[PDB]
């Protein structure tokens, strides 16, 4: 059961920057697609680097992805005081070449 | 009384395969869904296995037990025709199921404009009449089995002939089938959704899975064989124990086997068919 | 005179008799199905086979072929 939890979380007032993390740790023969939500989409990365953001994001956030060691994160920028609900990990994962692709969320974190 | 045991336990297998490749035949001719131009392929390596379980490894058991041919010399040329051309018509079909599936799985999209039935059934029909080509044309050219004595059953001696019926039979159809399955693993390892839906992908990636296990104890199953048999023609003094050289000689035999075997220990729906053909 | 005393794809190893021998020989020993263990050589009589072997003694040179 391949795991992915949040990270980076705290506190912090409008105007500050943040750096959530999210790794995948179990049983994965290879991660292609994974982004945070909102539910919502907020960001996206493929494992080839196609990045994509949502329309709500004009150019405010940058996600970035490491093909090394499994893991993906989101630099924050420019806090709103109505931007902040939910942010989920979710990430399509595979644990062999002959099984179907999955996927799976993660617990979440507020500001 | 090492022959009877010896014999209870290869007729044992025989019946077992027997057995096992009329329920794969059944399976597919008796459900509508399974009904496809890639389990025609598996229908056609089955009847293959049957005819050589049930016709052929008979008698080479019968011959093994005894030490000699026992049926006269006309029926040793039969024997040995139909054990050839099974042979090869089992590795070719096998071929056959590779590039199928290297199809399948590079071009899923246009696959059921490119594999249609009837190119299908023709490269059924190509296969085999290729298959009687390589194994009944050499049989002719290459001195029709010498021996004088009536009780044995030797195929040609020449070296030449072993060398193209193992090139032929073995090494030739081994190339495509290990390049075709090696294009399929690298494709299946690059792309993320293999025809843009989820069940196909999974759908796709089964049967590639089932073919690996098919090929890879195919490879186990008769490689020592084709490696220790045209050494000892080719080295006369490279002449091996011949407690191995039976060993292998049987080894790639239970194949056509175990094969039935490896059909529903693999996929669901095979298992399910094998239930429902047996209930019955 | 001379015999046979293998076959492969490189050739035929054949050598000369010594006196005594008249005729050549080539058994043919049981292995596995299609596959037999053939032993050819020099003999001044004919070797009596044993355990099914089949052995085909002649007389011309070069001829257990």
């Known amino acids: 059961q391949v795991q992915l939890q949040e990270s980076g979380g705290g506190l912090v007032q409008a105007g500050e920057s943040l750096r959530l993390s999210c790794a995948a740790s179990g049983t994965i023969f290879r991660l292609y697609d994974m982004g945070w939500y909102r539910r919502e989409l907020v960001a996206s990365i493929t494992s080839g680097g196609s990045t994509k953001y949502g329309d709500s994001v004009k150019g405010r956030f940058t996600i970035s992805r490491d093909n090394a060691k499994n893991t993906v994160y989101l630099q924050m920028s420019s806090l709103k005081p109505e931007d902040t609900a939910v942010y989920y990990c979710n990430a399509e994962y595979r644990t062999g070449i002959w099984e179907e692709l999955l996927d799976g969320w993660g617990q979440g974190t507020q500001v | ?280 | 005179l001379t015999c046979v005393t293998s076959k492969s794809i490189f050739g035929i190893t054949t050598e000369d008799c010594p006196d005594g021998q008249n005729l050549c020989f080539k058994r043919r020993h049981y292995v596995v199905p299609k596959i037999y263990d053939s032993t050819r050589g020099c003999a001044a009589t004919c070797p009596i086979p044993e355990n099914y072997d089949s052995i085909h003694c002649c007389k011309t040179d070069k001829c257990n072929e």
């Open chain 2, 1 to 280: 009384s090492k022959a009877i045991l010896l014999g209870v336990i290869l007729g044992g297998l025989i019946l077992f395969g027997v057995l096992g490749n009329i329920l794969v035949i059944l399976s597919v001719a008796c459900h509508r869904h399974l009904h496809s131009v890639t389990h025609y392929y598996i229908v056609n390596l089955a009847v293959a296995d049957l005819l050589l379980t049930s016709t052929v490894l008979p008698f080479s058991a019968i011959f093994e037990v005894l030490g000699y041919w026992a049926f006269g010399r006309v029926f040793c040329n039969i024997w040995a025709a139909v054990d050839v051309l099974c042979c090869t018509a089992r590795i070719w079909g096998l071929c056959i199921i590779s590039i199928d599936r290297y199809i399948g799985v590079s071009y899923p999209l246009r696959y059921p404009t490119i594999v249609t039935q009837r190119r299908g059934l023709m490269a059924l029909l190509c296969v085999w009449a290729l298959s009687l080509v390589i194994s009944i044309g050499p049989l002719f050219g290459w001195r029709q089995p010498a021996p004088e004595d009536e009780t044995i059953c030797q195929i040609n001696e020449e070296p030449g002939y072993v060398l193209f019926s193992a090139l032929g039979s073995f090494y030739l159809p081994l190339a495509i089938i290990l390049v075709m399955y090696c294009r399929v693993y690298v494709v299946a390892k690059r792309v993320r959704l293999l025809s843009g839906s989820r069940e196909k992908d999974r759908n796709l990636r089964k049967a590639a899975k089932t073919l690996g296990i098919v090929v890879g104890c195919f490879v186990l199953c008769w490689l020592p064989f084709f490696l220790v048999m045209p050494i000892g023609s080719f080295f006369p003094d490279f002449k091996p124990s011949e407690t191995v050289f039976k060993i292998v000689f049987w080894l790639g035999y239970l194949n056509s086997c175990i094969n039935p075997i490896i059909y529903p220990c693999s996929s669901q729906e095979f298992k399910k068919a094998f239930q429902n053909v047996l209930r019955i």
